Amino acid sequence: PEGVSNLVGLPNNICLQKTSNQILKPKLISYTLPVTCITDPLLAMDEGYFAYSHLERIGSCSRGVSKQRIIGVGEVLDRGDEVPSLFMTNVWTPPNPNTVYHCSAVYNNEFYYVLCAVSTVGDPILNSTYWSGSLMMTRLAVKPKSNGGGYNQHQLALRSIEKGRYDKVMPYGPSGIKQGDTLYFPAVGFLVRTEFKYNDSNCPITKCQYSKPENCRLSMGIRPNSHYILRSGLLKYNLSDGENPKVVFIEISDQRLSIGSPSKIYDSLGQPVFYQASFSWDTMIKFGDVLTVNPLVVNWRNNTVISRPGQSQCPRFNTCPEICWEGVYNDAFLIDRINWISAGVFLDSNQTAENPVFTVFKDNEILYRAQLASEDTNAQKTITNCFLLKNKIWCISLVEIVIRPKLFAVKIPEQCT
Amino acid sequence: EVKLVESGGGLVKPGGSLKLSCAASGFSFRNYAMSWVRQSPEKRLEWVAEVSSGGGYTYYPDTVTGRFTISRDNAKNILYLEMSSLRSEDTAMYYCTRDPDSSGYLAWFAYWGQGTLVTVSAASTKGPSVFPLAPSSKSTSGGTAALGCLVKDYFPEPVTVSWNSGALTSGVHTFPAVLQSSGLYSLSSVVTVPSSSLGTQTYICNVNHKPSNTKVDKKVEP
Amino acid sequence: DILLTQSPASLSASVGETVTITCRASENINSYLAWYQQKQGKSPQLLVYNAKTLAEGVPSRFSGSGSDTQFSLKINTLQPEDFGTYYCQHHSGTPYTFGGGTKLEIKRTVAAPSVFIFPPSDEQLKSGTASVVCLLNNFYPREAKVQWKVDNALQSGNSQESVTEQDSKDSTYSLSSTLTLSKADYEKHKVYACEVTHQGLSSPVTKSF
Ligand SMILES: *[C@@H]1O[C@H](CO)[C@@H](O)[C@H](O)[C@H]1NC(C)=O
Ligand SMILES: *[C@@H]1O[C@H](CO)[C@@H](O)[C@H](O)[C@H]1NC(C)=O
Ligand SMILES: *[C@@H]1O[C@H](CO)[C@@H](O)[C@H](O)[C@H]1NC(C)=O
Ligand SMILES: *[C@@H]1O[C@H](CO)[C@@H](O)[C@H](O)[C@H]1NC(C)=O
Ligand SMILES: *[C@@H]1O[C@H](CO)[C@@H](O)[C@H](O)[C@H]1NC(C)=O
């Protein structure tokens, strides 16, 4: 195809061997987007278009005054020298920036749809027993037209929500997928703790001498006595389900179960792939091909080399079941399915979040890496999407670094020197 | 809710006879005309019989005339199709259909039953052996493991495969049957599962060959 | 009689694209033309009748037009569940005749198949024949070349192929191939290989035993 295309078919060969060579040359491409403090980044990419979101806050990046929500879409052009960049095309700013949360983006047929939570009671993850179940869904034209009216920007009607045994459902991750006319956003189900069916004998504590069988069940919520547990999953939107289609929750299977965290479903090489932040004691990266979208079943990787920084209770590389809700979202994007090679930006430090490194890896072997900064520089969230330009695998990572997001374009190299 | 249910289809020797029946519910049967439509093995659709609502007026193509006879019981809400002198070229799936009005003739079919399968064949019914398709460990590309059942050497169509009595559906691929050179049908039903479930979830495939009065349940084990 | 001629024979279109099928009556049939969609092993489902009238609960993305001798059906905003065979029937009077059908496949991005190879079961070997089974799982396009070689010996005429019908939600096919040989010819060889050539496989993939 022309310009930027999804990672499908038979892409140009890539370096398939472990090498300390410096063969990844990232490129700072942030300059083609908007710059106070900036948290809650969203980067979704698909079919040559992209979606971006953030909240510009006043002073403190934790509790400052919410200045603005930016929900924006655009195209991924070859910027002029065979390097891809994001060029905004259509920006929407909610009226009330501090009632919009946990936005999640999916592209379908020259529209981005973005699913957010509406809350007048704070971050629903933190005030769940008080959060109204409400959801807002915005459709943005990726390439708006002159008097485009509703085509350019439209606020779709989120009438009904089918949620099974779940009190309330919510988007929880940057990007999702489409299958035909059905959008699957990555979501989380709030379940009353007392209905949560769990076999404590399946909490894996064999080599864990200070654990106890019931930490897993306990750290399925943000406190061990938390009113809800969070189960990750899919929110399903069927665009041909009438006037106002419903959203339907799909829970993730119980295999390698961990607290609902911010997650991501993405297509790669024709088939869907899932990623779940390790916000709990299971700190080894959770991702793998989707076996089936519904029920949601994910052939998790037995990955032994990639993890996330955490706090002192569940640090990097922790495996033992512990009571903890800590960690950062550092997603990865599968670039090669035959050999299961993937790229993402992870933070190379044990209990401090710092030193972001763009990394290409196997299940139990990092192949080649490339620091995006100095070992001192604190990073928090990383979102990585990969795609084809002139048939060459590239990746765009948003890497949080006060804190503001900065975008890197890293071409996956073919030779190993 | 309109419902039509065919029944009585089967294996018949070239020259024999059969009477198919269709039960109807969900609409006032007596005021509608009805029709029988069949589908050849090559999937060409072919209309066979029309009867007025009163049952006085029956219409037929040349191809089945004087061999078939459409009839109707407005008391028990049942439509019938008496077929005789059966030829190998009437081997077809047989759907009973509702007309849009009482007298028909200019009729499309908004309602069809599930069909009933008539095989006009010299051959004799033979029930199948159902074999386990073993998941190997050479299987486990990407951590998904595949298991199934081979329903082999039977006659005539159809057989039904279930898994875990209908509990297991997603992942299942019951394939069309293939006509072996020996002249019996064979089909294969597979389901793909988390390789991690292999040791801890037993998978029982439920085959049913209604003609031969077979049902087996071969448990597939690793 | 009345002859309906459907064009085209078959058809492949992407989700969202608009599709159109035409049907041509041998002789004037007014607007007495009907349209059905049929998927696998199910009674055909009435879409259009009276050339232009939609049936109950048929999506409005289905339209039909025509009169006299030429008619057509339209599906705009094609949908993954719109695969099947589409037949036209005339109801201008008896005998009713249908058209040969138009086979509609949903077009999607390429998708390489998973391959699993199944060894003949002991139960089956006690009977005196062995069938080895290969499954190509959830691939697109349909077109694959499966080959059994037995001991790097290309096999032929001892194999049969059965293809799933296109999946309703993601438009993938699946394939099983059955290599069938007697318990004697099965003793005789070492390499039992399944080889799969596909658009999304740069190199043919082989599972074997
Ligand atoms: C949750 O919302 C309720 C209702 O406004 C309030 O009483 C409570 O303080 C809130 N909790 C927070 C903001 O943590
Ligand atoms: C939970 O799993 C263990 C592991 O076999 C088992 O012994 C225990 O009885 C299970 N409890 C249930 C199923 O209630
Ligand atoms: C979307 O809706 C249509 C009709 O409502 C249905 O036929 C189709 O299967 C649905 N797709 C899903 C549920 O993925
Ligand atoms: C610190 O990093 C080392 C890597 O050399 C790792 O093996 C160790 O487990 C880490 N320590 C903690 C407490 O996580
Ligand atoms: C991961 O390991 C489990 C056993 O620990 C195995 O059953 C599963 O298939 C493996 N998954 C992958 C993708 O390798």
- Cα–Cα distance, C26 to C11 (Å, whole number): 23
Does the N-terminal peptide bond of residue A295 adopt cis geometry, omega within 30 degrees of 0? yes
Q: C44 vs B112: CB contact, 8 Å cut-off?
A: yes
Beta bridge partners of B204: B219
Running DSSP on this structure, what letter comes out for residue B98?
E
Starting from the CA of residue A303, give the closest ligand. Answer: 5
Judgement on whether residues C86 and C21 belong to the same structural domain of the protein: yes
- Cα–Cα distance, C193 to B27 (Å, whole number): 57
Judgement on whether residues C165 and C94 belong to the same structural domain of the protein: no
Distance in Å, alpha carbon of B220 to nearest chain A alpha carbon: 20
- Nearest CA to A400 out of A204, A174, A228 is that of A174
Q: Using a CB cutoff of 8 Å and minimum separation of 24, what contacts does A89-94 make?
A: A89/A142, A89/A143, A89/A144, A90/A140, A90/A141, A90/A142, A90/A143, A90/A144, A90/A152, A90/A153, A92/A138, A92/A140, A92/A153, A93/A68, A93/A69, A94/A69
Residue whose CB lies within 8 A of the most ligand 1 atoms, among A62, A66, A126, A127, for a mutation test = A127
- Nearest CA to C110 out of C7, C204, C200, C13 is that of C200
At which residue do the structure tokens 């089945």 appear? B64
Residue-level length of chain A = 417
The answer for C37, left when phi > 0, alpha when psi is -120 to 50, beta otherwise, is beta
Q: Number of structural domains, chain B?
A: 2
- Cα–Cα distance, A169 to A125 (Å, whole number): 11
Does the N-terminal peptide bond of residue B156 adopt cis geometry, omega within 30 degrees of 0? yes
**Contact yes or no for A381/A54 (Cβ under 8 A):** no
- Cα–Cα distance, A103 to A69 (Å, whole number): 10
Starting from the CA of residue B135, give the closest ligand. Answer: 5
**Contact yes or no for B77/B29 (Cβ under 8 A):** yes
- Ligand 2 midpoint to CA A202 (Å): 8
- Nearest CA to A175 out of A327, A364, A356, A383 is that of A383
| Secondary structure of A54-119 as H, E, C letters | EEEEECCCCCCEEEEEEEEEEEEEECCCCCEEEEEEEEECCCCHHHEEEEEEEECCCEEEEEEEEC
For C83, what's the count of Cα atoms within 13 Å in the CB-facing half-sphere?
Answer: 22
The residue from C75, C107, C139 where one domain ends is C107
Q: A288 vs B143: CB contact, 8 Å cut-off?
A: yes
Judgement on whether residues B57 and B95 belong to the same structural domain of the protein: yes
- How many of the other CB atoms lie within 10 Å of CB of B33? 23
**Contact yes or no for C140/C171 (Cβ under 8 A):** yes
Closest CB from C43, C85, C176 relative to B175:
C176
Closest CB from A253, A299, A337 relative to B144:
A299
State both tokens at A21: 């060579």
Starting from the CA of residue A254, give the closest ligand. Answer: 2
- Cα–Cα distance, B156 to B124 (Å, whole number): 8
- Nearest CA to A415 out of A84, A81, A21 is that of A21
Which residue lies with its CA nearest to atom 8 of ligand 2?
A201
- Cα–Cα distance, B51 to B42 (Å, whole number): 27
At which residue do the structure tokens 């077109």 appear? C143
At which residue do the structure tokens 């997001």 appear? A405
Closest CB from C94, C164, C209 relative to B105:
C94
The CB of A122 under 6 Å from ligand 1? The reply is yes
Judgement on whether residues B97 and B116 belong to the same structural domain of the protein: yes
- Cα–Cα distance, A277 to A273 (Å, whole number): 14
Q: What is the CA angle C81-A178-A88, rounded to 5?
A: 140
Amino acid at A206: T
- Nearest CA to A285 out of A272, A293, A275, A296 is that of A275
Supply the Cα-derived Rg of chain B in whole angstroms.
21
- Give DSSP secondary structure letters for C72-126: EEEE-S--GGG-EEEEEEE-SSSSPBBB--EEEEEE---BPPEEEEEPPPHHHHT
The residue from C72, C107, C142 where one domain ends is C107
| A354 CB-contact burial (10 Å; exposed 0-12 / middle 13-18 / buried 19+) | middle
The answer for C14, left when phi > 0, alpha when psi is -120 to 50, beta otherwise, is beta
Q: B112 vs C49: CB contact, 8 Å cut-off?
A: no
- How many helical (H) and strand (E) elements, i.e. helices and strands, does chain B have? 0, 19
Q: C176 vs B190: CB contact, 8 Å cut-off?
A: yes
At which residue do the structure tokens 């386990």 appear? B132
Which residue lies with its CA nearest to atom 4 of ligand 4?
A350
- Cα–Cα distance, A345 to A397 (Å, whole number): 7
For residues A324-350, one letter each, b for 16 or more C-beta atoms within 10 angstroms of the residue's C-beta and e for the rest, the string is bbbbbbbbbbbbbbeebbbbbbbbeee
Judgement on whether residues B116 and B134 belong to the same structural domain of the protein: no
The CB of A317 under 6 Å from ligand 4? The reply is yes
Which residue lies with its CA nearest to atom 14 of ligand 2?
A199
Residues 6+ apart with CB under 8 A from C181: C129, C130, C131, C150, C158
**Contact yes or no for B143/B130 (Cβ under 8 A):** no
Judgement on whether residues B140 and B112 belong to the same structural domain of the protein: no
At which residue do the structure tokens 């050179």 appear? B181
State both tokens at C83: 């695969």
State both tokens at C160: 């049969």
**Contact yes or no for C105/C83 (Cβ under 8 A):** yes
| C104 CB-contact burial (10 Å; exposed 0-12 / middle 13-18 / buried 19+) | buried
Residues of B in contact with A300 (CB under 8 A): 143
Q: Which domain holds residue C157?
A: 114-208
At which residue do the structure tokens 């809350």 appear? A119
Closest CB from C91, C120, C162 relative to B175:
C162
User: Helix (H, G, I), strand (E, B), or coil: what is residue B135?
Assistant: coil
Q: Provide the CATH number for the domain around residue B19.
A: 2.60.40.10
Judgement on whether residues C164 and C74 belong to the same structural domain of the protein: no
- Cα–Cα distance, A344 to A360 (Å, whole number): 7
State both tokens at A312: 């002192």
- Cα–Cα distance, B173 to C138 (Å, whole number): 10
Beta bridge partners of B92: B118
Judgement on whether residues C145 and C67 belong to the same structural domain of the protein: no
**Contact yes or no for C206/B138 (Cβ under 8 A):** no
Element (H, E) at B10: none
- Cα–Cα distance, C66 to B140 (Å, whole number): 54
- Cα–Cα distance, B86 to B15 (Å, whole number): 5
Residues of A in contact with B192 (CB under 8 A): 291
- Give DSSP secondary structure letters for C126-184: TTTEEEEEEEEEEEBSS--EEEEEESS-B--SSEEEEEPPPPTTT--EEEEEEEEEEHH
- Cα–Cα distance, A202 to A216 (Å, whole number): 9
- Cα–Cα distance, A102 to A185 (Å, whole number): 11
- Cα–Cα distance, A280 to A262 (Å, whole number): 12
Q: What is the CA angle B155-B159-B161, rounded to 5?
A: 145
Judgement on whether residues C81 and C148 belong to the same structural domain of the protein: no
Distance in Å, alpha carbon of A293 to nearest chain C alpha carbon: 10
Which residue on chain A is closest to B169 by alpha carbon?
Answer: A295
- Cα–Cα distance, A122 to A100 (Å, whole number): 9
Closest ligand 1 atom number to CA of residue A126: 14
Amino acid at A155: Q
Q: Which domain holds residue B141?
A: 129-220
Judgement on whether residues B60 and B146 belong to the same structural domain of the protein: no
- How many of the other CB atoms lie within 10 Å of CB of B166? 8
Q: A270 vs C171: CB contact, 8 Å cut-off?
A: no
Neighbours of chain C (3+ CB pairs under 8 A): A, B
- Cα–Cα distance, C23 to C206 (Å, whole number): 44
Judgement on whether residues C101 and C15 belong to the same structural domain of the protein: yes
- Ligand 2 midpoint to CA A199 (Å): 6
**Contact yes or no for A91/A70 (Cβ under 8 A):** yes
User: Helix (H, G, I), strand (E, B), or coil: what is residue B31?
Assistant: helix
The CB of A315 under 6 Å from ligand 4? The reply is yes
Residues of A in contact with C81 (CB under 8 A): 180
- Cα–Cα distance, A147 to B4 (Å, whole number): 53
Amino acid at A141: A
Judgement on whether residues C156 and C99 belong to the same structural domain of the protein: no
The CB of A308 under 6 Å from ligand 4? The reply is no
- Nearest CA to A263 out of A290, A234, A240 is that of A234
Judgement on whether residues B44 and B115 belong to the same structural domain of the protein: yes
State both tokens at B208: 């049913």
State both tokens at C195: 């080889």
Judgement on whether residues C14 and C95 belong to the same structural domain of the protein: yes
Judgement on whether residues C124 and C195 belong to the same structural domain of the protein: yes
Judgement on whether residues B25 and B55 belong to the same structural domain of the protein: yes
- Cα–Cα distance, B7 to C116 (Å, whole number): 38
Does the N-terminal peptide bond of residue A204 adopt cis geometry, omega within 30 degrees of 0? no
Residues 6+ apart with CB under 8 A from B131: B149, B150, B152, B218, C120, C121, C123, C124, C131
At which residue do the structure tokens 């990383």 appear? A382
Judgement on whether residues C67 and C155 belong to the same structural domain of the protein: no
The residue from B56, B88, B120 where one domain ends is B120
Residue-level length of chain C = 209
The CB of A147 under 6 Å from ligand 2? The reply is no
- How many of the other CB atoms lie within 10 Å of CB of B108? 23
Closest ligand 1 atom number to CA of residue A120: 5
Judgement on whether residues B150 and B177 belong to the same structural domain of the protein: yes
Supply the Cα-derived Rg of chain C in whole angstroms.
22
Amino acid at B28: S
For C34, what's the count of Cα atoms within 13 Å in the CB-facing half-sphere?
Answer: 22
Q: C163 vs B175: CB contact, 8 Å cut-off?
A: yes
- Nearest CA to A220 out of A237, A187, A198, A239 is that of A198
**Contact yes or no for B72/B21 (Cβ under 8 A):** no
| C187 CB-contact burial (10 Å; exposed 0-12 / middle 13-18 / buried 19+) | exposed
For A258, what's the count of Cα atoms within 13 Å in the CB-facing half-sphere?
Answer: 27
Chain B, chain C: beta-carbon pairs less than 8 Å apart? 138
**Contact yes or no for A198/A220 (Cβ under 8 A):** yes
Supply the Cα-derived Rg of chain A in whole angstroms.
20
At which residue do the structure tokens 């390790």 appear? A278
State both tokens at A149: 């009216």
The CB of A310 under 6 Å from ligand 4? The reply is no
Judgement on whether residues C102 and C15 belong to the same structural domain of the protein: yes
- Cα–Cα distance, C48 to C70 (Å, whole number): 15
Q: What is the CA angle B177-B178-B179, rounded to 5?
A: 125
Judgement on whether residues B7 and B116 belong to the same structural domain of the protein: yes
Judgement on whether residues C102 and C122 belong to the same structural domain of the protein: no
- How many of the other CB atoms lie within 10 Å of CB of A63? 8
Q: How far apart are the first and last CA of chain A?
A: 28
Q: Provide the CATH number for the domain around residue C188.
A: 2.60.40.10
Residues of A in contact with C116 (CB under 8 A): none
| Secondary structure of chain A as H, E, C letters | CCCEECCCCCCCCCCCCCCCCCCCCCEECHHHCCCCEEEEEEEEEECCEEEEEEEEEECCCCCCEEEEEEEEEEEEEECCCCCEEEEEEEEECCCCHHHEEEEEEEECCCEEEEEEEECCCCCCCCCHHHCCCCEEEEEEECCCCCCCHHHCEEEECCCCEECCCCCEEEECCCECEEECCEEEEEEEEEEEHHHCCCCHHHCCCCCCCCCCCCHHHHCCCCCCCCCEEEEEEEEEEECCCCCCCCEEEEEECCCCCCCCCCEEEEEECCEEEEEECCCCCCCECEEEEEEECCCEEECCCCCCCCECCCCCCCCCCCCCCCCCCCCCCECEEEEECCCCEEEEEEECCCCCCCCEEEEEEECCEEEEEEECCCCCCCCCCEEEEEEEECCEEEEEEEEECCCCEEEEEEECCCCCC
Judgement on whether residues B39 and B133 belong to the same structural domain of the protein: no
- Cα–Cα distance, A154 to A140 (Å, whole number): 7
Resolution of the structure, angstroms: 3.0
Closest ligand 5 atom number to CA of residue A300: 13
- Nearest CA to C79 out of C39, C19, C164, C140 is that of C19
At which residue do the structure tokens 């290969």 appear? C134
Residue-level length of chain B = 222
Closest CB from A10, A180, A270 relative to C15:
A180
Q: Number of structural domains, chain C?
A: 2
Judgement on whether residues B76 and B149 belong to the same structural domain of the protein: no
State both tokens at A196: 């949560």
The residue from C84, C107, C130 where one domain ends is C107
Closest CB from B143, B170, B195 relative to A292:
B170
Q: What is the CA angle A169-A173-A174, rounded to 5?
A: 135
